[PDB]
Structures are given as structure tokens and as C-alpha cells.
Amino acid sequence: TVRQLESMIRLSEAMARMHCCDEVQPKHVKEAFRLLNKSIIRVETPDVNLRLGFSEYCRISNLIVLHLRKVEELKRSELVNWYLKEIESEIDSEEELINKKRIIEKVIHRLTHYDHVLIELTEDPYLVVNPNYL
Amino acid sequence: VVLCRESQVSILQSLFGERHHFSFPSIFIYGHTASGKTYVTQTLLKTLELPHVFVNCVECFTLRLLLEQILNKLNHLSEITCETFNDFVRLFKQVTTAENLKDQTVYIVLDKAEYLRDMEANLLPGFLRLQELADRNVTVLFLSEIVWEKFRPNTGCFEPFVLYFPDYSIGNLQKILSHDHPPEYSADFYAAYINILLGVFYTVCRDLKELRHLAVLNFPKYCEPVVKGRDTRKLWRNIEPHLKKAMQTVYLRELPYYSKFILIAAYLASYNPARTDKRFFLKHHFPLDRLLAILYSIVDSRVAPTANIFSQITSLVTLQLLTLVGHDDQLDGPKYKCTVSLDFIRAIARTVNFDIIKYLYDFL
Amino acid sequence: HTECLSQVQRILRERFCRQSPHSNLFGVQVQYKHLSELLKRTALHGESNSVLIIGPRGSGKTMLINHALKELMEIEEVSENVLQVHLNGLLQINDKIALKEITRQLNLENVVGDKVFGSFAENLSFLPVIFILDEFDLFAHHKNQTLLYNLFDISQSAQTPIAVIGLTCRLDILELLEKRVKSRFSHRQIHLMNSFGFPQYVKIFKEQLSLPAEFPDKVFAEKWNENVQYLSEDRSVQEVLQKHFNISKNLRSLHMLLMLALNRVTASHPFMTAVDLMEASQLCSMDSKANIVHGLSVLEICLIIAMKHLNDIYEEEPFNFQMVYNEFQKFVQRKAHSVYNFEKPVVMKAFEHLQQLELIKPMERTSGNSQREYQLMKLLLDNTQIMNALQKYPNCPTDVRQWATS
């Protein structure tokens, strides 16, 4: 009900106060939307095959799908280069960079050949989004 | 020709050996629907040029038909009519003595064998041990979709050699689909077509026949943009919505006035427990009479019990919308069941301007 | 070279596939001695006897009779006076057909007559002939056991000598007979059991794959005998033999395994290898259910996992299509935006296909009154089987695997 809307506003304001920001930004809204949605929650998500967490897997999938869908209105190497450009704010060492390259290569391959969300079109194959992913 | 089928062919050829050699009395081959059991064995038999009789169990729904067809085809390979299995054995022994049938193995291919267990009790055991009884260098093959575990009789019989046809994969399916490319365009064009089609539909439809049928249907729309004037992006953008519309249907390929009220009343009677009926219809606080009372309550106008409403009831029963439960002779206490989907009843209520959800006890 | 390989292939195929007679007999000395002695008594004199032989299927029941007949018929001119009749429970299912076969084999249709007349006193009044009865148990299920009673009566009568031999796999053949025939049945029973140890099984395997002394090439035969002798003590071959001996002691399975092993014998490999026997044993011992599950698709796997969850939550209770559909919808809705947007008809078709493959069976079958929907279904699989099959699935997605684990 409207009470949940007021709670959402309160949560956004709390996020804004946490970051010492005089104005509220949509990032806080996106953050609070998950917390309001989750409800039933496990202790810990299991690992996914070097292992990676389910939340990070979903985050990478969402980012790559959003970028490809935005560009729709690409190439494998170009997309990897974009991702590494976007994540430069977190990597601080060469080892972390090579780890990130390994992870993104593995994730793109896994999406291409297991989850079928990414479709290959014919060393630099074209990648397209399966038209039934929202 | 056969593609991605080389292990099984080699195994069968090794099993056969030479013409004068003997083989197993019974081989039971099982696999999936699109494994190609009929294609591979028939092509192999044609290539090796062996005396073989091909039989469909479904066509021979009676024992006499089966035996007569087998005997007639075998004679044509070299009129005869038989009635009992022993007579069939004797006539088979008589007919197998031909010079062309002297030192050669005789093969009886049976397909769709799943019905054999429903024909006769002793027919399957007799067919299993045919080589012992005839003693005339005879081999019998089985093709089926059910595992051998369910074909075992209670008394137990001569165990056939069991064989499995491997399931298909992405590469095998792509190769098979790309073999029969149309001559009017490049092979790589059809390969890309097969690639995108598999990337779209492999999740659900793995049937080779079905996927090939879909490709045949959808190719003309695939080839339009280039005719209109190797542009992968252009073709994909032009073609995606049509593929989505096609995927909407993978395996699929106005009542009278009072009839609508009868149908909705029947649905209410079926899916609403009797205890709550008055709670929904009595102004103050399944058998035919309950249906009549509910109909009288729902309709705002006074409806006379003309025979035409009973004719409507019987017509609805005939149209397989309402199922009769009780005995047909008992036409004073009849029982009915409603078999209409909920979406259909909601649509008809919308066309009637009636809100059925307000009366459904389960939803409340 | 090639000709020798072809000849040995023919000989071994005849030995295994057709079960041609062989002088070698294993652990059946006393039984065969008794049976041959009694056959000689029944042939050289006018005395009558009735015997039943009980054993598991494939234990060489027919071999004893065939060897005894080939041993004793050619002794003297008694074979001229002796007549043999063979009746099988599978071919003759009715007493009329049995009477027709008896008349035709005895070549008395000219004496008796050609028409379908039910009178049989032509033979009965006229009635040394031996009878062999394969699948003796089936005759006991006839309406009145008339044929068995008449055979026992003429055996006990003082008109003509008749010897009756029966074969049975059931151990309770005595209780399937009526009191009268049981009283008139001479309680003569022979039991055929595989009463021998594992070393004797190894000796049987070594002897069975041994070339006979009548083969043309002698040095090749000696080399073959040395090769099989060497392969006898190889621990992989002994492991395979131990596995099959634990499974079943029947010689028919051993013959089948040896035939399959010999199938992989070519010119480049004239002599077998332990790896060949390992391959044959692996080929003979694979489960069909796991293969069938492996041959499925993604949607069927999801439906099966939902079915397993239903069986776990509701302990040993049936189910229908609607509950499975509802919980599949729950699974696809909890996940944010996974690509599983399917409508009702396609899932219904998948369920129909699953029922067609006979992994799911209805209870108290009826049609018309109940649709395919709202029908009580049950699963015919075990949880460990599903887990093992899912482990070997080629391209199982992560989401469905974790849902299965949950």
C-alpha cells in the first residue's frame, strides 16, 4: 500500500544521508528497490564455477545485457574493452586486471553456450541478445 | 546417406559377418523419437542387399494379418493363408527351403513393437525363440521407444541383445540440417540460417523432423530482404520479430444466448461447493435441480421451462462441453461435469457482462 | 590367415548362437547317467516311466535330453521301433491343436481321417513311442488337463509302453496338477542347478573358448589355446568373470558375453585382449533409465525436478498437471527475468510426451470422466537416479541445477 511507498521514500532518504549528499539520487532508489523486494532470504548463496557468487553473476549479466540492448539503438573484444574501461575504478593491480579478464571471458562463454541468453553470429564473432530476455 | 552414424553401422556390419554365418536370434534396439532407427536400419539393409521383410506392427493389428503379410512378402522375395502360430511355423519351414534362402540369414524387421505386448501372451516369446524352433538361420530385429525392462514377460524368455542409438548434439543436428541445402544460395547462408534457428529453438524443440519442418516453413521469409535489396545485422533486424511470432506457437501448427447462461451455471455448480450456494444466491440469511435453481437465480428475466432449454442441454452434452456421469437409462437423476477452461468462461462472462469472479468461492 | 579366421568365426558362432551339441558336460554326470539309464530301460524293454526335470531357464535343460538321445538311439536297431514326438507349450496352446499335431507327427491322419471331427477314439483305442514336452507348466493351465491325464493313464496302463519327459522352470510344478494326475504321476524328479564354484566357472570359460582338435591348422590352434590359457589368469579378465558370476551363474549369459567379445575379433587382431572383454562387460551392463533421462531436453528436466520436489514435500502422494504448472510458474517468477516465458499448451505437450515415454503412469485408468488434466499421476524414478543423470547432463544451466539442489 501507500505505506510501502513512504517506506521507499524513507529508505532513499536514509541512503542519501549515509553518503552525506544534500540531494537524493536515483542510485539510492535502485538500491532500496532490491531490499524491499527480497523478502525471504537464504543464509548464503552457493558458489558458481575459481568460484564466483550468484549476485555478482546476475550483476554482470544485467550490465552486459543492458549495454548490448542500449547499443542496439557489437564485437566480443570491443565489449570486453568497454567492460574493463567501466570497471577501472575498482581494479588496483595487474593481478586483479588479469583475474577480471579471466572472469569476463568465462562468463561470456558460459552465457553463450549454457544459458543461451547470448547468440553468436559469424576471431571476433558478433554477439546478440536472445530477444526473450527482459 | 547417414551422417554422424558410423559406430552403430560398424557394429551391425561386424555382427552380420558373412551371409552363410549365423547371428543372434533376437536384437532389441531402443532409442529416442528422432534417433533415426527406421532410416539407418533400412538404408543398411538396402546397401548390404540382404533378404529382409519390413513389417509395421500397427498395420497388422490382427495375428492373421501379420502372419499373412510376412509370408506373402517372403514369398515375393523368393497365395498363402495361415491362421495359427504353429501353422505359421510349419509354412515358414516349408517356404525357407529355397535355393536363394538356403545358406543365407533371413531378417524380419518389426517396427513400432510397443503394441506387441498387447496382442497375445505367447506371441512375443514365440518370436524371441524363432531360430530354435525353425532352425533355419533366422534373425528377428526389434525397434521400439520403450526400454526392454517393460517388455519382459512374467515367465521370462530368451534375452535379446540390447542396443541403444546415441542421442544427437548441436554439431550433429547442424550438420544434418545443413546437408540438404537449397542449390540456389551459398552453403554458408544456409549454415548461418541453421545456426540462428538452433540458437533460437534448441531449448525446447530438439526433434529433427520438427525443426526441419520449421526451417522449411520459415526460409522464404528469411530470403526476402536480400531479394528486396551477407548483411548479417540487416537480416537479423528484419527477421527477429517473425521468429518471435513463430516461437509463440512451437508445437501447435458464438453460442446462443441461454447457452452461455447454462454454461456459466454449470461451471459454478461444478467448481463451487454446495454448502455455500445459498450464501451466494439466497437473498437472505452435481444434480440437475441445483443447476436449474442456479440458472433461475442468475437470470434477471423469468425464463419459462420450454423444451428448447432441454434441447440446449442435450446439445451441449453432445458437443463434449458437459460430461454425463450417471447411467444413460437414468434420466431422472442425471449427473453432469463441466470441462471448460477458466479463461474461456471468463471471456464468455465478459461477453455477457457478468462478473464470475465475485461468485467463485475458491478465489474468495 | 583370413580363411582360418572365417572358419573359426563360423565354428564359434555355431557353438554359441545355435547351441550346437558338444561332448563337454559340466556338473551333470549323475543326472545324465540316471536319465540315460532310464531311457535305455524304457527303450530295450516294454516298461514305462514318467520324469520331470526342473531348472532355471538357460541351464541347458534341452541339452541333457538331446545328448542322451544322440547317445542311445544309435545303439542298435531299437531306433527303428522307437518313435519320438515333440510338443512345445508355446506352439500348442489348445488341446485340439495338440491332438492335431500328435496325429500329424505320427502319420496316422490317413488312418484317423482328415476332417475336423472331435472324435479321438481312433488313436485312443489304437494306442514304443517317447514323448517330449517343453514348457510343461503351460499344459497344466488347460481347462481340464485332459491331455496330461490321458498320457499318465496310458503310461500306467498295460497296453503299450510310453515314456513321458517334462521340462519345467517353476519349482512348484507339483501343486499345479490335480489330485488324480498327481497320484498317477510317478514322482521322478531331476534338478538342474549350477552347483559349482567360481574356479569351476573359470575352467568352463577356458574350455568353452578352446578350439576343437578337428581344426585343420594345428599350430594356430595350439597358439590359440596358449593365448586363452594366458588370458585365463589375467586379473582384469578374472574381475569381469567375478562380476558376471556374482550377477548370474547361467551359462546363456556367458555365451552371449563371449559372442559379443568375439565380435570385435578382426584380421589385425586375431587374438583377443583383456581390454576387449572389459569393453564387452561394460556394454552388457548399462542401465537404460539413465540413458533415457540423458536423452531428454531442458523443459523435461525442469518438469522432472518439479515432480521430485512435489514427491518430497507430499510424501508418496499422487499429483496432476495443475500443481506442477503452478510451481513451475512460481520458480520462473521468483527469478527476475530468466528466459523461460512459455505458455500452457507447450508445457501440456511436454507433459504428454513425458507420459508417452512411460516414465509416468496413471492410477485407476479412466477416460472421458477425467481429462488429461486433474488426473492422478505418479513418478517411476528415484532421487539418486535423477541426481546421477543430472550430473552427466551435457549443458545443464546453473539455475536449474541450483533449483534441483534446493
Ligand SMILES: Nc1ncnc2c1ncn2[C@@H]1O[C@H](COP(=O)(O)OP(=O)(O)OP(O)(O)=S)[C@@H](O)[C@H]1O
Ligand atoms: N543420422 C541421420 N542421418 C541422416 N538423416 C537422418 C538421421 N536420423 C534421422 N534422419 C532423417 O530424419 C528423418 C526422420 O527420422 P526417423 O527415421 O522417422 O526417426 P525414427 O528413429 O525412425 O523414429 P520413428 O520410429 O519413425 S517415430 C529420416 O527419414 C531421415 O531422413
Ligand SMILES: Nc1ncnc2c1ncn2[C@@H]1O[C@H](COP(=O)(O)OP(=O)(O)OP(O)(O)=S)[C@@H](O)[C@H]1O
Ligand atoms: N552342464 C552343461 N554342460 C554343457 N553346456 C551346458 C550345460 N548347462 C548349460 N549348458 C549350455 O548352456 C547354453 C544354454 O542352454 P539352453 O539350451 O539355451 O537352455 P535350455 O536347455 O534350452 O532350457 P530352456 O528352459 O528350454 S531355454 C547351451 O549352449 C548349453 O550347451
Ligand SMILES: [Mg+2]
Ligand atoms: Mg521410424
Ligand SMILES: [Mg+2]
Ligand atoms: Mg530348450
